[PDB]
Design a protein around this ligand. Structure first.
Ligand code: NA
Lengths: 30, 21, 30, 21
């Protein structure tokens, strides 16, 4: 699922799945 | 940032994990 | 969508929608 | 944290926005 273009909710979803119990930060304007 | 690396270009696990806490 | 129990991907999705271009942080172990 | 406030209990906009950057 990760080696593709991932935008918007799709990217958030990938972060969620990969990062698991760590959580993550989503800072699109960087 | 993440949008440039993963949305506008092809993402990687390596890049994604940089945004895990 | 926000005034309910929101867990896992559902919570991430709500953050994404509410926070918009700001982005957000998801730090479940807090 | 957010899970306690929004998953285990009923979320609010007020709470969600505290986690926006
Ligand atoms: Na953060």
């Amino acid at each position: 699922f990760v080696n593709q273009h991932l935008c918007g909710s799709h990217l958030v979803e990938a972060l969620y799945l990969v990062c698991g119990e760590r959580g993550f930060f989503y800072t699109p304007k960087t | 940032g993440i949008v440039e690396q993963c949305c506008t270009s092809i993402c990687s696990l390596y890049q994604l994990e940089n945004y895990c806490n």
